[PDB]
């Protein structure tokens, strides 16, 4: 905004985004799906839910 050899001035426009939490979860586990093997009319099959 101003520039002299002994004096300056500046302006900055900052925008912020604040997330507001509804709930926070701390003690968490990932799932892993191993399923089961089945043998049927000669064919080996992997089964999963």
């Amino acid at each position: 905004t101003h520039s002299s050899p002994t004096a300056t001035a500046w302006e900055i426009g900052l925008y912020y985004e604040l997330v507001i939490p509804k709930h926070i979860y701390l003690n968490n586990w990932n799932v892993v799906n191993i399923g089961h093997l089945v043998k049927s009319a000669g064919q080996l099959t992997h089964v999963t839910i």
Partner: peptide, 23 residues
């Protein structure tokens, strides 16, 4: 003279547990 190798018994313990629904 006669030299022979007699088998002798031994074991290792193996434990197993289930995984409900495979999860």
């Amino acid at each position: 003279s006669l030299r022979m190798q007699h088998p002798v018994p031994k074991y290792v313990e193996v434990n197993m547990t289930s995984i409900p629904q495979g999860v």
